[PDB]
Amino acid sequence: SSSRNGRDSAAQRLGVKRFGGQVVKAGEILVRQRGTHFHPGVNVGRGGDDTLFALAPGAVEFGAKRGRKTVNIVPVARP
Amino acid sequence: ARNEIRPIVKLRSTAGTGYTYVTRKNRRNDPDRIVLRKYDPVLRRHVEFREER
Amino acid sequence: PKAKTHSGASKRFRRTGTGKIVRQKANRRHLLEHKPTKRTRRLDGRTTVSAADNSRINKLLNG
RNA sequence: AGUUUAACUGGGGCGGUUGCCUCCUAAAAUGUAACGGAGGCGCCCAAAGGUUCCCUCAACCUGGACGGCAAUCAGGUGUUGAGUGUAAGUGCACAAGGGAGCUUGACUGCGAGACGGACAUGUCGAGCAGGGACGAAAGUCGGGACUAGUGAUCCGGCACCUCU
RNA sequence: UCAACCAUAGACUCGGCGAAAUUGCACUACGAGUAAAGAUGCUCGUUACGCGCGGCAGGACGAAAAGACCCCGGGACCUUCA
C-alpha cells in the first residue's frame, strides 16, 4: 500500500548567465552546462564540468561554427 | 564510511629522506609493492616514495 | 550584575582593527582522503562573517 | 529510584518514507509542492588516470569447412541507428568510442574575477613560482566525458616542525 | 387489549414570611431563501389588538459542568530480555 516513488534531486542552476551584448570581465562564467551544448570559440575556455568562461574581456557573440552554437568574446573599444 | 577490510584498502605513502606522507586509496587483490612512485617533498624535489602503510 | 560572555562565540569569533568579525571555515578536520586540494585550500585562512549573522554575533560576544 | 521511547501523514493507527544524483509534472531563462510518476547510489580504477600518435563503429547484402539467428575472415552499402566502467539526461564521428609507446600533475605554494547564494556547505577558475612527465616543438597535465559515490562540530590518535 | 372511578400530600385560589441557579440587549412571529454551509434580529412576502393566568414541552444549537470518545503538549503510575 506504498508509493515507492517520491524522491528527487535538488537543482544545479544551469543555463546561460551572460547573454548577448553584455560586458564580462575575465574568468567570468557565461554558461554552466553538462555537455557541450555550447562550445567555445575565441577568447573562451572550457572547464571541468563543461562550464564555459572568459579568457579575455569583452562582449558576447553566440554564433555557430559548422553547425554548432559557439560562444565568443570580442574586443571592447578602449575609451 | 567505516573501517571494514574493504576491497579499496590501504593508505600511507612515506618518503625516503622526505617526510611528507602523500595518501592514496587502492585495491589489494593485485600484486605489487616494491617499484614505481614519485612526488615533491618539503625542501626537496621530485623524488621517490614508498607506499609504506 | 554584569553581563556574562559566551564561551563558544569568544572561541570561534574575533575582531580585527576596523571592527570586522572573523571566522574560520568548515570541512577541514577529517575525511581528507578524497577531498581535492583546491577544496582543501579555499577552506584555509579566515573569512569575514556574513551580514545576516553579524548582529547575533555581536550580541553573543559582548553580553 | 530518575527518565527517554521521533516526525511526516488528506484525524490518528497499520503500512511506507526521511540524505544524494538523473528525467517528466515544471507552465520555451532560473526556481517551484504533493504519501505524484520512472530509476539509481552509500562504488570501482598499474590504469578504466596523464601525454604523443593512429583507426573508425552497430546493422544489412554476398561469399564462405565443421558453424547454425549469430563466433573469426573477405568484399560492398553504411554521418553515426553501436559504444561510452555503473541509473538517466546533456554531449561525443571535429570524436570524450577503439588501439599502441613512455609514464605518475591521482603534485607543492597560491589565486584575479565569477556563479549559486538565508547561513554553514558547494562549483568552475585563466594566470605566476619551484620541481617534473609526454612531445621534435607549439602546448596539455592541480584525476577519471559531466553531474551521485558520502557526514559538520566537539574529543582523542600517528609522523614532522627552528612555536610555548 | 383499554382504560375508568374514588381518597389523601402536592399542584390551583386567598392571608403571611420569602429565596434560587441563569442573565450582552429588547415593545423577542411564520414561511421560501441568503449567510461561518441548521436565522426571533438580514432580504422578499404572509399573518398578528395591548396586558395577564393554568397547562404542554418543538426551538432558543436551552441551564449545569474551560468534553470524560478522538488528536497534540506535559505529568503521573504500571511493566519488561529499553
Place this chain on the structure above:
RNA sequence: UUGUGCGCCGAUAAUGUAGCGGGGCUCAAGCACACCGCCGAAGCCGCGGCAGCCAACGUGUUGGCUGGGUAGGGGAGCGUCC
C-alpha cells in the same frame, strides 16, 4: 435535405405559493440590432476649514502633490497624584 434566431417534450421531493426579489406583464413591463435622454456612489468637479512632504520667497505667507488602514515603526499632546 444545409446552416441559423427564438421555441416544445424529456422535467422529476418531502414546514407554505416558492427555479422573476414581489405585484403583475405578450393592448410586453420579454429576446435581438441600431438611436435618443435620464437616474445613479463617500468617484471627479464647485465653495470653504484643518493637516504632512517638497519648493519658491520673506523674518511664516503662498502654491503643487498628498492624507482608508489591522500587526507594527516613528512623531506630537490632554489628564491625575506628590
Place this chain on the structure above:
RNA sequence: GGGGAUAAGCUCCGUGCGUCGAGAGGGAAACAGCCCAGAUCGCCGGCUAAGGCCCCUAAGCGUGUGCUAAGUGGAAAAGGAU
C-alpha cells in the same frame, strides 16, 4: 496544470494577475473575495461609471424595424417531433 471520477465551497504548485485579509460606499433581492470605485471634514450644489428607468424604487407603460405564444423570459442532458 498535477492527484481525484478529467467530482467536490476538495487538495497541491505557478502568475509585476486581482480583490479580501487590513477596505468603507453603489450594484448584485439579502450575500468577506464578483463588476464599479480606493472614504481629509462640512454643503437641503452639479456631471458620470457598473447597473437600471410599469408600481413597490428616483429615472422611459421611450423611438424604429423584425422574432417569440412557450408565462419561454424567470435551471438542465442523451434523444424525439409536419
Place this chain on the structure above:
RNA sequence: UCAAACUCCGUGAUAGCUGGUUCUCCCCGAAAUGCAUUUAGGUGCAGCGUCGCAUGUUUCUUGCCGGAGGUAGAGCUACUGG
C-alpha cells in the same frame, strides 16, 4: 477526595498553552513565501515594513537593436515506442 492523603515551606515552581493588558491625535504601513528544524500550531536567518544616515534616479514604464530557450501548436520513410 487516594494509580500513592493533608498542612507549612522550596515557591511568585513551570507551561512551545488559553485568557486579559486601561488616554488622544499625526505620518508611513505589511505577511500568511523559501531553506533548515526531535520539526510541522512554535522558532532562527532571508523575504515584505518603517525610522536615521549615506548614494542620487541607479528602480519602474514605453519604443528600437542584440541573446539563449524546446512550452502551446504541428510533425513523423526526421529518431525512440503504439
Place this chain on the structure above:
RNA sequence: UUUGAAGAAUGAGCCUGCGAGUCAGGGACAUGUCGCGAGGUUAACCCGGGUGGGGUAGCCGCAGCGAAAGCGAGUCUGAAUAGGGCGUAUCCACACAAGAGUGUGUGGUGUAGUGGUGUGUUCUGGACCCGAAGCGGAGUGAUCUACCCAUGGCCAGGGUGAAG
C-alpha cells in the same frame, strides 16, 4: 481569536472601588543632549549637620599582524618582492605603469574618544499579569473506614432431633 463571526464560537447580570512592560546594575548595543577634548573619568575610602572637596588603584582610547616565538606601518603564510589576507580615518593635488576592472610612490588636510543623563531593545533576577496536573523536605492525622490486641455485653420465639 479566526482565511472568514450579527453570528446558533468564547467572555460579560448592573454599579462603584481595586487589578498587568516595573526596579536594580560605572552591565551590553544603537541613538539624542551636556562637559572635557588626545585625552576622558574615578572606585572603595577620608573629611563633610546636606547634595561638596580629595582619593591614580583601575578602565576606555591613542598601532596592528600572527596560533606562538616574535616583528612593527607593516606583518603572516611561502623557497619567493609572487600573488593573497588583515591593517595603515577619509578625502585632496602631481606623477609613473597599465585600462584584467586601477595600482604604486611623494606632498600636504590632518584623525576623536570619553564621562553623566534621557529613550528603545536586551542579559542575570519572580521580570507585563492570572492560571495547573504534579516533584522534594519537615511534620499532622486510625474519634470515619481496613485489620489486630485487652476486656465486657447482646442475639424474642418456635421447629428438626447428631454423637453418646
Place this chain on the structure above:
RNA sequence: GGCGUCUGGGGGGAACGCGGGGAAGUGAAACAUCUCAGUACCCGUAGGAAGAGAAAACAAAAUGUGAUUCCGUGAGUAGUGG
C-alpha cells in the same frame, strides 16, 4: 556498683556565625553528567559579635613583599565545561 556531701549543666529566643548533613521542581526548548544550590531545610554548639590568624605563605632572579579578615579593581578576563 552502693551511701553522703559540694559545684555545675538541663530550657526559650527575631536575625546575624562556625563545623556537619543536604534535596527537588526549574535551565539545558527532551535528558542522566552538569545547573538550580552545597540554596531551602535538619542537626550540634556559640558570642555579643563570630570564625581565621602569626608563615612548613606569596613572588621571580626585582636586592621584593612581610599575621589575618572585610571592602574597590584585576575579571566576567586567564581558564573550566556533554
